[PDB]
Amino acid sequence: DQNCDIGNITSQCQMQHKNCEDANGCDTIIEECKTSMVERCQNQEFESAAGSTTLGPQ
């Protein structure tokens, strides 16, 4: 069933306009591409840490 695919939306932005195609590393442009649709995959993405726990260096 998958836990949703974390790499659904990001992949598109990663190649286009992302120095280093990695989250939680060069995370800036990916951020918006990510949190948008990857909110569902928050479990996997570890969004900051959960969400309200807005830990910068996730």
Curated annotation (Swiss-Prot):
Keywords: Disulfide bond, Glycoprotein, Pheromone, Secreted, Signal. One of its GO terms (biological process) is sexual reproduction. It is found in: Secreted. Its main location: secreted. GO terms for cellular component: extracellular region. Disulfide bonds join 4-41, 13-33, 20-26. The keyword Disulfide bond applies. The keyword Transferase does not apply. Binds to temptin and enticin. This is Attractin.
